[PDB]
Amino acid sequence: AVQKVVVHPLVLLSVVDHFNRIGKVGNQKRVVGVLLGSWQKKVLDVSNSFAVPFDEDDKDDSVWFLDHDYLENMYGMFKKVNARERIVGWYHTGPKLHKNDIAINELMKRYCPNSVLVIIDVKPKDLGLPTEAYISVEEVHDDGTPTSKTFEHVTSEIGAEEAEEVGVEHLLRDIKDTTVGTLSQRITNQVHGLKGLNSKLLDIRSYLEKVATGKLPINHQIIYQLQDVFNLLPDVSLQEFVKAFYLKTNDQMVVVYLASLIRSVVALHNLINNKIANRDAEKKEG
Amino acid sequence: DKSKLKPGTRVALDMTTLTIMRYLPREVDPLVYNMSHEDPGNVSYSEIGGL
Amino acid sequence: MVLESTMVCVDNSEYMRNGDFLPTRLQAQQDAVNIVCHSKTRSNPENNVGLITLANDCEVLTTLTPDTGRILSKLHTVQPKGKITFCTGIRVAHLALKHRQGKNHKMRIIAFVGSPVEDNEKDLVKLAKRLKKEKVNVDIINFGEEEVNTEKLTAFVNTLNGKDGTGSHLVTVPPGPSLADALISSPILAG
Amino acid sequence: AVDTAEQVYISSLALLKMLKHGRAGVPMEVMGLMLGEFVDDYTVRVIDVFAMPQSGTGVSVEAVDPVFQAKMLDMLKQTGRPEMVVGWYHSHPGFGCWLSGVDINTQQSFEALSERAVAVVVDPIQSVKGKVVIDAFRLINANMMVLGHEPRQTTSNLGHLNKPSIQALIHGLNRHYYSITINYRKNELEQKMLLNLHKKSWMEGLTLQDYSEHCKHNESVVKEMLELAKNYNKAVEEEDKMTPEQLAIKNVGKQDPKRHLEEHVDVLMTSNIVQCLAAMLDTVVFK
Ligand SMILES: [Zn+2]
């Protein structure tokens, strides 16, 4: 239903500072808060957020509290200072998908119809993007209990804004791999993207570990996609795909040959522009 | 409503920072308005005669 | 005035479903809640009163507020039907008591039982010594009908005012459908 | 007294709050409140900023409702953690930064509460990347200006490091207020999680980029690159001629083949080589 999301650095830091301001609890706390923003053109947007007062105990871990007085009053304030701004969903700090995050969404679904969640990271280390968002469905299959409230991950990305890029680029001042030439693609996706294939490669290997040892659900709805992958594995070197390849490339290196061929003539013309500069400078200057 | 600022329309500005504050409708200068509706003469076809 | 925050736990379970008490059980304990929040409110303007239940779905129907009109509106057509779950009533009380406005306030809860309980006394003695280690003073007032003589409740309040607590109370239900105001006339006079 | 070595520390979030709320209602002078720990006589550490909604239409600074900041002061008290109000701000939008006569009044209403309150001006237009432009201020007493006496008694080579702007020098600059050198507090906990997340492709370079139109676009550059090279067979020939400064001023009406050429050579080059190598890795990786 909703295509993808847009997340700002303001909300991105604006969870982490709250994790600091409850960071004096020491023992254990998750950061849970209310996510605010709009969505237009079936593109989700996230602009602002805050956090709800919240506690939890491990013994009888089916008890949670969201102060709706704080919710109504503070969102009334945010509506008052910005009527354009509104509710969009929620977020929890999300290390590993806590258990109450199946009916928190049911607790606050009366506010937003597509009451969406956001899982973030407070210990940032990965080779990907540590921002996650699911969506609520209660989809029905064809075996066992039908209507099952399973969250489903819609794709996610960090959105920019012309206002906030001044502050972001100001707060970097650290490293910036611009001059995007023949190098920046090699590292933004050719070095790094293979490691992007490494983790998704290793993930199904980790799921695979139930061979006779792991959890109880065997396959049913996992192996049609895997069987579809191994059926969908590409063509081997026999056909014209080789000769179209060879044939293909062979066309591209022509254009490479022309471009490199003109570049040397350009630099040689600059050398003549240099000779004229130094010669008619030696006898004239002295 | 930046979709509604047509090339041609009349708008208001800011004095200091010089930004556009509010779109406006068209206006009618004093001369015309005092050309519009200033005759309370209520003569009729009954008064005229002969043509 | 004196620092507490009154947290009432209402009983919307499925054994609250007759007119044995004269107007309505719901209206009777409802107006009891009204006059005890007049007592706590008019004895202390700082005290706020919100309501929780200990049924299957322990909902915060009203957020903890010094208002009473939302409390009245939710107690209108509250639909007291569902399976009671008392063992999570302790956690859904105390965790909100950690959610309260200030820990300078006295942890005081009133708890309403008008249904048969299926708890283990081991479970409420783990939660009871949990309330000992958390220093929590709850006076439980029984309503409606019950397993006679509060089975596990005397042991619970005993393991609540035990170890120099000795100030907590357990008002049992008299099994006669009378006007409950004189039934609760003792804790409102002296806790 | 002070030593013009005050050194305000702020945050890594409040700058974002200032630019967002200063940018959303930008042609009106929006404002709000500042909220952080007040450390010693020299420094201050303002960790948080929440904004205040306006009073009505009109370019000014409106007023402050202590009902509203009394409540909002307590929302974080019963939810997050207690802090202290230390300063406040407004927004000269595209002006630069100074104190107006209206600004100095509402400042003067705040310094009587706490003597080390802070005036702050954000300018969310003239900032691009390295120029954020804030320059927090505070009043100086005009009584000592009547005394003809110099305040603020410099004990450290820390004050006169930034030269003041000429427009604030036209304004009350040094006769009613002073500047404060500021900087920022940050950590790798934030630096990594904003660097690693801002501009990230996912698996996009592991694609093939419109495989029919790649060679077609390659044609679509080389074709006019021919005639542009004919212009390079035109523009060299007026050397051994008039001086190259006249061959500098004279070329401001018509295009040159040189720079325009070496642009397209780069575009064809990096356009081709990425599609080549990225085309060839998948042959190994996928079967
Ligand atoms: Zn101003």
PDB file of N, CA and C in Angstrom, chain B residues 12-19 21, chain D residues 59 95:
ATOM      1  N   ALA B  12       1.565  40.764  -3.073  1.00  0.00           N
ATOM      2  CA  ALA B  12       2.165  41.638  -2.081  1.00  0.00           C
ATOM      3  C   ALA B  12       3.544  41.118  -1.708  1.00  0.00           C
ATOM      4  N   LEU B  13       4.374  42.007  -1.186  1.00  0.00           N
ATOM      5  CA  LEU B  13       5.751  41.671  -0.865  1.00  0.00           C
ATOM      6  C   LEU B  13       6.029  41.911   0.611  1.00  0.00           C
ATOM      7  N   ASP B  14       7.292  41.754   0.977  1.00  0.00           N
ATOM      8  CA  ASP B  14       7.810  42.238   2.241  1.00  0.00           C
ATOM      9  C   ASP B  14       8.672  43.463   1.980  1.00  0.00           C
ATOM     10  N   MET B  15       8.686  44.386   2.934  1.00  0.00           N
ATOM     11  CA  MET B  15       9.545  45.550   2.785  1.00  0.00           C
ATOM     12  C   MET B  15      10.989  45.226   3.137  1.00  0.00           C
ATOM     13  N   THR B  16      11.214  44.638   4.308  1.00  0.00           N
ATOM     14  CA  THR B  16      12.581  44.440   4.775  1.00  0.00           C
ATOM     15  C   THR B  16      13.254  43.279   4.059  1.00  0.00           C
ATOM     16  N   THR B  17      12.744  42.068   4.252  1.00  0.00           N
ATOM     17  CA  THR B  17      13.420  40.902   3.711  1.00  0.00           C
ATOM     18  C   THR B  17      13.059  40.636   2.263  1.00  0.00           C
ATOM     19  N   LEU B  18      12.009  41.290   1.757  1.00  0.00           N
ATOM     20  CA  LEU B  18      11.577  41.245   0.361  1.00  0.00           C
ATOM     21  C   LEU B  18      11.263  39.806  -0.069  1.00  0.00           C
ATOM     22  N   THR B  19      10.205  39.283   0.538  1.00  0.00           N
ATOM     23  CA  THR B  19       9.648  37.991   0.176  1.00  0.00           C
ATOM     24  C   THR B  19       8.169  38.160  -0.124  1.00  0.00           C
ATOM     25  N   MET B  21       4.433  37.567   0.396  1.00  0.00           N
ATOM     26  CA  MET B  21       3.577  37.232   1.521  1.00  0.00           C
ATOM     27  C   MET B  21       2.216  36.712   1.100  1.00  0.00           C
TER      28      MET B  21
ATOM     29  N   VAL D  59       5.767  40.585  11.162  1.00  0.00           N
ATOM     30  CA  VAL D  59       7.190  40.333  11.324  1.00  0.00           C
ATOM     31  C   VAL D  59       7.731  40.976  12.593  1.00  0.00           C
ATOM     32  N   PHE D  95      19.101  38.595   7.018  1.00  0.00           N
ATOM     33  CA  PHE D  95      19.578  39.893   7.453  1.00  0.00           C
ATOM     34  C   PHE D  95      21.039  39.870   7.861  1.00  0.00           C
TER      35      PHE D  95
END
